[PDB]
Amino acid sequence: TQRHVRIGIIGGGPAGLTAGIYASRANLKTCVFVGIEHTSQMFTTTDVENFPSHTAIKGPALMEAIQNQAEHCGAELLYEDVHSIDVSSRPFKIVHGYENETTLADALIIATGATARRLDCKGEKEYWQKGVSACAVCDSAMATGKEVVVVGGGDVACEEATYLTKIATKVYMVLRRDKFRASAAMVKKVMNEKLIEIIYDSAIDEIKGDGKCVTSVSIKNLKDGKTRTLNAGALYWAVGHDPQTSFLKKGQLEQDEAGYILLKDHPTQRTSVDGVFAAGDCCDHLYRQAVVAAGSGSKAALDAERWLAMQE
Amino acid sequence: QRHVRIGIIGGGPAGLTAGIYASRANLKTCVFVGIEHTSQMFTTTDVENFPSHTAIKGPALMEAIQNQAEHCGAELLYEDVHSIDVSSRPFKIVHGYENETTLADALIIATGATARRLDCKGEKEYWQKGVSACAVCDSAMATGKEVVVVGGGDVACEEATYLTKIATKVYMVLRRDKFRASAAMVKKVMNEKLIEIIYDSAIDEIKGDGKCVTSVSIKNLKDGKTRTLNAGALYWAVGHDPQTSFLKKGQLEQDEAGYILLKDHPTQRTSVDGVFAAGDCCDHLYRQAVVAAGSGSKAALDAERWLAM
Numbered sequence: 001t002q003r004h005v006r007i008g009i010i011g012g013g014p015a016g017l018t019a020g021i022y023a024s025r026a027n028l029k030t031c032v033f034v035g036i037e038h039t040s041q042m043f044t045t046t047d048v049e050n051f052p053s054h055t056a057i058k059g060p061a062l063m064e065a066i067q068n069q070a071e072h073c074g075a076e077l078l079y080e081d082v083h084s085i086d087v088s089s090r091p092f093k094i095v096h097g098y099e100n101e102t103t104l105a106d107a108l109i110i111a112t113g114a115t116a117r118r119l120d121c122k123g124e125k126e127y128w129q130k131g132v133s134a135c136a137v138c139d140s141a142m143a144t145g146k147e148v149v150v151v152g153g154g155d156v157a158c159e160e161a162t163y164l165t166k167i168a169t170k171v172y173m174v175l176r177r178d179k180f181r182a183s184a185a186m187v188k189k190v191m192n193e194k195l196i197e198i199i200y201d202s203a204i205d206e207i208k209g210d211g212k213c214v215t216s217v218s219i220k221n222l223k224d225g226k227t228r229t230l231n232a233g234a235l236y237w238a239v240g241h242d243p244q245t246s247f248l249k250k251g252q253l254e255q256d257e258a259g260y261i262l263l264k265d266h267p268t269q270r271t272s273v274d275g276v277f278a279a280g281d282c283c284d285h286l287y288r289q290a291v292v293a294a295g296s297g298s299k300a301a302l303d304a305e306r307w308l309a310m311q312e
Numbered sequence: 313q314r315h316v317r318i319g320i321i322g323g324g325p326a327g328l329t330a331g332i333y334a335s336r337a338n339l340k341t342c343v344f345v346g347i348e349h350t351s352q353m354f355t356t357t358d359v360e361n362f363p364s365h366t367a368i369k370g371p372a373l374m375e376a377i378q379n380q381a382e383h384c385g386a387e388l389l390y391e392d393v394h395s396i397d398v399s400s401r402p403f404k405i406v407h408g409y410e411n412e413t414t415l416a417d418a419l420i421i422a423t424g425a426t427a428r429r430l431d432c433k434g435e436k437e438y439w440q441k442g443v444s445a446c447a448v449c450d451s452a453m454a455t456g457k458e459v460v461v462v463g464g465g466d467v468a469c470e471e472a473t474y475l476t477k478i479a480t481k482v483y484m485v486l487r488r489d490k491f492r493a494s495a496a497m498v499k500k501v502m503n504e505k506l507i508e509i510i511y512d513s514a515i516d517e518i519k520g521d522g523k524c525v526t527s528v529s530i531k532n533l534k535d536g537k538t539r540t541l542n543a544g545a546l547y548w549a550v551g552h553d554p555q556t557s558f559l560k561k562g563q564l565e566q567d568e569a570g571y572i573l574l575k576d577h578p579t580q581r582t583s584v585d586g587v588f589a590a591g592d593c594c595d596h597l598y599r600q601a602v603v604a605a606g607s608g609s610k611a612a613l614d615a616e617r618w619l620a621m
């Protein structure tokens with residue numbers, strides 16, 4: 001009937017599954033909620049070349065290998081979504097499944113990842129390989145000696161734009177808000193750049209090209225509904241990522257504006273609530289790698305093991 | 313002369329993962345693996361907690377990571393590094409038996425930290441047959457058995473506590489008459505009914521049946537009296553040695569123990585700008601291959617970011 005675990009892990013990605021490995025091997029009863037509506041960012045990627053011990057591996061195959069390992073080590077994998085948690089009382093409560101079952105957990109690890117915010121756009125699909133890019137340093141050959149567009153106002157985008165001033169002749173920053181969701185040091189570097197032109201209250205309407213390269217971009221003001229075109233050799237998407245923390249309530253866990261869970265005792269994975277830990281992309285915007293997420297998972301699980309043990 | 317974009321000192325999980333990330337970023341990169349140093353993963357047999365491998369041998373894992381780094385285009389140099397110049401840029405790495413110098417625009421230190429093993433009768437005989445230095449890593453040797461943990465620090469207290477869930481009984485054997493650990497850990501360990509604490513004693517002899525450890529003999533240091541414990545495993549928890557001797561004290565900020573301090577969490581930044589540290593040479597807390605590899609990636613990304621000046 002009622003499930004009580006020592007460690008409850010919300011997320012079945014690299015961070016979550018790795019956490020499951022360590023928690024289960026500690027001989028602490030452990031379950032991992034993998035999700036059903038949610039999936040790992042790794043399933044969407046085709047070829048993984050930078051995970052240690054694999055020259056090349058498919059994301060789905062990498063994820064299957066790690067899942068099998070978590071099962072073998074004795075973690076219980078549940079293909080169920082978490083709807084809410086309770087952090088006011090211990091044992092912690094986790095509400096999940098189609099019938100809103102409650103699982104009791106003595107410690108929580110949150111590894112719910114993040115999503116891409118993929119733009120349903122005319123030319124986003126057409127020019128994703130060519131012209132449109134998600135990484136400025138990776139596709140900087142497109143920017144060199146050209147006019148360029150960067151989307152979003154945040155740390156990711158603000159650093160992409162300042163970098164592309166070294167290469168691009170002109171950098172256009174398109175924000176969908178009144179101001180930036182970013183640091184005052186980064187806004188000062190951006191707003192004192194002559195090669196940057198900051199466009200506020202705007203969204204990307206269409207990406208135009210010759211079929212090979214992007215030659216112009218169309219923008220429409222949100223309030224106005226008016227659209228204008230900009231000549232550019234490439235569009236650099238840098239909107240940012242959405243941590244999958246919508247199941248959380250305001251004041252449960254300390255978070256930033258974007259919703260990333262904050263880490264309160266570096267280099268540990270401790271959150272603002274004791275016995276609650278966070279790992280992977282849901283608390284890391286800087287790095288965003290499978291091996292990095294996996295590293296956090298291990299750290300979170302070991303943090304939870306030490307914390308639980310001191311409670312006895 | 314060799315000039316690289318990133319210089320990585322160490323060819324373990326952290327070092328090699330940095331090499332992979334830096335090489336794939338199309339940066340000229342070389343990794344100093346060592347001749348008279350080797351990765352600590354070569355000392356262990358069965359790795360069961362590295363993600364994507366249910367069971368893999370330590371050497372086999374390392375070979376797979378090495379080949380990967382080589383394939384991504386990182387130059388693996390099998391040579392020891394004796395010193396570095398960190399006052400000027402490019403940074404200089406002095407390595408090899410002919411004291412060749414290599415220049416690097418960025419540095420990544422990942423020399424790891426060696427777990428101490430103490431010599432006694434049968435220690436080397438039964439290494440990885442019930443004798444180990446990481447309880448988290450080799451808990452398969454402890455399952456359903458009585459075991460020994462040696463040491464009186466925080467690590468010995470953690471490792472013994474971690475083992476009470478796995479083993480039927482834990483013996484903590486202390487050379488001294490007193491712990492050198494936090495008041496919190498000493499209280500926990502002494503109130504744990506599954507632990508017996510032994511003071512003023514050292515490990516006389518590790519005993520087995522040819523396949524596995526089956527008993528550990530303990531000798532008291534004060535009176536010389538011998539005692540024999542019914543232990544099926546022994547765990548060394550008497551400290552780690554960060555492999556940071558090639559540094560001159562003062563060059564980089566460090567612990568008393570010699571761990572390189574990280575100065576801008578959660579990054580891999582050291583006290584000197586342009587120099588990053590990854591893995592167990594800057595981590596005394598977790599000490600896992602997956603954690604180390606994670607930090608290596610973070611270090612290589614910190615370096616690339618820093619190189620966009």
Ligand SMILES: Cc1cc2nc3c(=O)[nH]c(=O)nc-3n(C[C@H](O)[C@H](O)[C@H](O)COP(=O)(O)OP(=O)(O)OC[C@H]3O[C@@H](n4cnc5c(N)ncnc54)[C@H](O)[C@@H]3O)c2cc1C
Binds near residue numbers: 016033041049111290
């Ligand atoms: C296009 C693309 C390509 C990439 N390529 C690479 C690459 O080649 N190499 C690399 O290292 N990294 C790559 N990354 C980054 C990498 O995929 C992520 O950093 C990594 O997957 C993060 O791991 P995670 O465990 O934090 O989250 P994820 O791997 O995304 O896992 C999130 C998990 O949480 C679950 N979840 C979320 N919400 C809930 C809920 N409410 N209830 C239950 N479960 C929930 C999901 O179902 C999922 O199991 C790529 C990312 C993208 C977008």
Ligand SMILES: Cc1cc2nc3c(=O)[nH]c(=O)nc-3n(C[C@H](O)[C@H](O)[C@H](O)COP(=O)(O)OP(=O)(O)OC[C@H]3O[C@@H](n4cnc5c(N)ncnc54)[C@H](O)[C@@H]3O)c2cc1C
Binds near residue numbers: 324326362392394
């Ligand atoms: C018995 C035992 C079993 C273990 N089992 C596991 C396990 O199953 N799973 C797990 O995750 N972890 C395990 N660990 C922990 C693991 O060994 C470490 O966390 C990991 O090796 C650290 O990786 P690293 O890259 O930081 O350092 P290392 O892997 O130790 O690599 C250090 C590198 O630096 C090089 N180097 C050092 N000094 C110099 C120099 N002066 N010049 C040039 N090169 C140099 C070395 O040759 C080496 O290549 C175990 C440890 C022990 C003792």
Ligand code: NA
Binds near residue numbers: 078097
């Ligand atoms: Na269920």
